[model samples]
Target: NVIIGNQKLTINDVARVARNGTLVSLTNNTDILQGIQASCDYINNAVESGISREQASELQTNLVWFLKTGAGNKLPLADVRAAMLLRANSHMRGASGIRLELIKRMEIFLNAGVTPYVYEFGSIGDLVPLSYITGSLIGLDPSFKVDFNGKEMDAPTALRQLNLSPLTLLPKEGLAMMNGTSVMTGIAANCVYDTQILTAIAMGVHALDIQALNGTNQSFHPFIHNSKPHPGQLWAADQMISLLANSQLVRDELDGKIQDRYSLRCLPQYLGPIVDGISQIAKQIEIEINSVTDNPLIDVDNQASYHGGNFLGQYVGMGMDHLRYYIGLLAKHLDVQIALLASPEFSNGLPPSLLGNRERKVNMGLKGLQICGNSIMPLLTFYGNSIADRFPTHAEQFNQNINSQGYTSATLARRSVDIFQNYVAIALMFGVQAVDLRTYKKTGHYDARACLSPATERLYSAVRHVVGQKPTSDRPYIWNDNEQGLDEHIARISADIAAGGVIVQAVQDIL
Candidate 1:
């Protein structure tokens, strides 16, 4: 809404004019323009002087293949939004020496329905791979392919078709666009977001497991959690208390123990830090998401350029690594809980492996699934801080000696999320089945509809809805870690044991 050069300009107006005609008038504000010009001059000088010649060429080549090859030729549609958001946020800071016009187009690329395949590779948080996104958005050349709202076409062809024109490059515009921690930040942000959902669902499942175990609910009393005064522990305890509020099973002191096992007794203590870990990771990621992660940062107002290792992804790498390790511990917690639930001696009263009918030869209950959970546990636990292990002399002839390893850390975390989700799903399957079997013990015949809590009942229905078969008749109920939606025997169940699916949604609003 500010006035510049007799022109009234809103940011929105920039996009409007850019899309409408050949000429786009931006702010003639002296400070911003001087800074922009200075940056352009610096990069222009660099290009002419042949500094970073090999690197510049790589940026040029990577940006050229957009729709034809996708973003950096490595990422799929899944990684697009995060990568775009991270890049756009970095540009919005106006410190990377990129022009205002280029920054405005970033807004368009974000809104555009088309997703350019962004490669997930990281070079000490370098933007060589990230520049591909900017290249497609600017539509500078036909070499850069673009997906213009689902229509795959050359960058130039798509620009012309949409009545948009390509931007003529400025000096360091290319380098300004690429070098940063956006890729790792995107991956970390995505991982943290999904981790929140998974953690919430885990809370719900733990409540259901408590109910199935006929364990004492007093352990989660607010008074008990408040004594420890850890926010995550208190919240974790509160969630379980809320989920079990009206449950018939929770009130059944007749069969319940006065004190439950440590896993059950210390639920909040065990799970609280995981909740806190995700929160901590998320806070760090939010900062990175909003940060100006680039090289030779242009201080437009000051008319000074500062160059250092702003591209280092140490913060993001460490944040993601921390979450990965904590979630690995969570997987182990779930594995142990399921083991206890399946053990006849450990469960105190439940049948061996929580079998539907102990006399029936065909029902092995969740014994195989427990074995599968055990197999998955060690692998989830094995990925340590990848970035910490790697040293300097990583890229650019010792220029980027101490690498952030953000990309590697994020990739490991991504893999952990997939494994952890299935591991949790497998546990929920076991817990829900145990709930059914435990219900049958008191009711004489299993009628789950009659006993499960309103909150827990929805999860039970959702799980049964997808898994769709009894342990007695269905021998292979545990969908192998690699197998989900790939199996035909799950009956007509529309369930995916993944946390964000129906089971989580069933009680999503509740938590």
Candidate 2:
């Protein structure tokens, strides 16, 4: 790429030179009429025919950008890979070009009951009035598989044939990719993913605790599961039995009491909904991700993809709200189990705090676990509908304004999801500590260490790989930097969820 204005030629110049410079790369990426392959071939030949040095630089800049964004090479393990899929799908839908489509889609998105609402978009006073989240897709990566001139090809192939690459990640491109709320969706997906696994883990831990406490296993029998077959109920019971199988402690406790505390006795009912949440929430996430959640999508065919409000993200806002409720329920019920485990009387005959045979016993050794679990409750409760239900004062007395009346509940729901995601993450972190104690007591070693150990092994793996590893001999399972960055995971996954629709092939390929 040639240096223009003291730096480098831009992808902007690439679009500008061909038919005019005003058309951003978005126009071509979705141009079905000019299919990427044919366009690339034509462009490259023209360059050989002595296209201007400036135009050449723009074209080259575009080519490189697309290459870097492709799935094969060395892109960071982005949580937002799905959004690229959505972008490509958007191209297929209408063949609309970027800038032009944004105008049209925005109008569509805004007119519906949907409005552009993003997590953490609240509380930004005046520093940055609007924060869009379309950072990965928009027009930055040429890796998209779009239709050009009624022909289909992946974005990279189109770029290659045209002798082009994607553009560098500048504000507009960044805004186009992350200017919407997709990033938060990707991160939320990741958070829920962890919480869902841990919900099962926590129940597993609870079952193990029962073994430690000499409680009866009759509570999880098939008769009970068959009677109340809520799916999650049956599934939770099945999992509890599976994980607790072959345990010396569990087999010995077979004759305790027919019933026990809610935390112990109601295992199927309590954690079952959590399991259910995983399925329902996943459905919504897939829908949002598979869709094009951006403003003013491109209409390359009609040359009329103008800006409006297609980028509005109320569905995400509402969906996350519901997810927060599920996450909060998990934290609340799991915390109850935690409280029971720590209570001397509640724990049956275990030490004052289920300290097992540890030399020193008090709440101190386990105090952090206590504090951490309890501390997350408020966060879990914080995201649902509490803060978002505030009344709109502008039209308060006008008599026709209903923002406060109709909007409060949903606002709270989205807020709750945010809070719940954060809380669940924190709870999961501490849940590992509790699981470690049980594993150590049973296995004579902390589960989180090296060598194939079960105690805290999963927890250890999660901390290392976002949610950690299972017993995989293949070693394909490895490290993940997101193991503990609470908010960061949510942000990253949110984008992926938003882009999930368009990036299905790429993401599936990665797997």
Candidate 3:
């Protein structure tokens, strides 16, 4: 249990509150509320001494108004949950000077299936979407509405329906709520969670690609990686070796060449850095999620007040920037592996483009897939490389200068992952096809399935179901202008590469 200003708040307390909507022994206390009033009085003295009431009200109006200026859309529920969790923990630390009543309202509102309309852009470190969130919670503006149990209702009515009353913002309540790094941190947290999972998936795919190309497993030997002693290198090499266990392709001396291309041979060397990078990114994101990113905090226990830039999000910016770089590097490696599989110079005696048609018949076997695979990298590079190096926008009259650009960097990483998944799905299509064709060439007979590792065979089976075998010359393949069905095929494959995709579930135990 965490004690804050004479109130005990346990994780189970909030967890229970979240699940069943019971008050968890935290309430509006006179002494605790007095501590909040003291801090509010301090800020109120400053506003009355210097700024007029009309000016303060206008400033708030402008703050809420900015929430509508950006590309207005609702944030995903995961993002909303992250932001609210961060804000609640910040106030629960008993340093933000916000009333206990205000904090309870945050809890009650969050549990009511009510989420504010947060846009996708314009939140550097201590900025909305935020004002929209704060405005909705405090019922400051009726123009801003929240989603309550799938119904769009004004804040006041929504509060009434939830059996909660609207809050009257105290002196520092509005500024305290808006002046934080929850939004950028929220996006970063979500992005890191996604990258970690997809990184594991990519490793499994790389193992499949190695079998498809008849590459040597010597490069991933246990002794070789142990000599280097890089943790990431060792982990990747172990997983790759395990995936190829009991596979005939790696054991066949005649089928394998003396050495494979670097994309195949140096799998651990390149992929190790990506593994390490994603690990580091996840560590940083977890820290940011727990840390308080508010400003002008008041320590109620010590009866002291302080102000600073705790909301600066430069760390999140660089972490996400580094994440994008490594993911792009992964994309580059995957592209090269696909190229080696398609080229006649490589692929270890497999037909060029994994073609089943040697009759000069009008059929394109994965040649169009190679073109589609190569097209997504330039976009990944443009958005992924040096994304954190964007020029800082000095807004709020230069007082909010030296912007962190964390939100933009986080968003760019997300987009890069999307494009990378497209490239990966396309490449996996080609890789599985090459494995099927190579199995046929060696065995001299077409079985219903390819000889593959247990881990990869599962993925290969899924891909074959999506991209069925080419018909014989009697039933030629159809290709109208624009390749007739290229877009639809890639879309179908890409969906399978998503988080809850069939492949993720198919290889869940192994991964």
Better of 1 and 3 by lDDT: 3
Best candidate according to TM-score: 3
Model 3, C-alpha of 333: deviation from truth (Å): 0.6
Instruction: List, residue by residue over 48-150, the lDDT tens digit for candidate 3.
Output: 6755666665665566566555464556655665566567666655567676677776666665677777777766654676777777787776877888867
lDDT of each: 0.65, 0.42, 0.67
Worst 10 residues of 3 by lDDT: 472-481
TM-score of model 2 (CA atoms):
0.52
Clashing pairs in 3: none
Predictions: Cα RMSD each: 7.5, 14.9, 5.9
Ranking by lDDT: 3, 1, 2
The model with the greater lDDT, 1 or 2, is 1
TM-score, every prediction: 0.78, 0.52, 0.81
Q: After superposition, how far is residue 172 of candidate 1 from its true place, in Å?
A: 2.4
The reply for model 2, stretches above 4 Å from the true place, is 1-89, 99-184, 251-258, 294-310, 355-363, 386-511
Report the C-alpha displacement of residue 21, candidate 2, in angstroms: 32
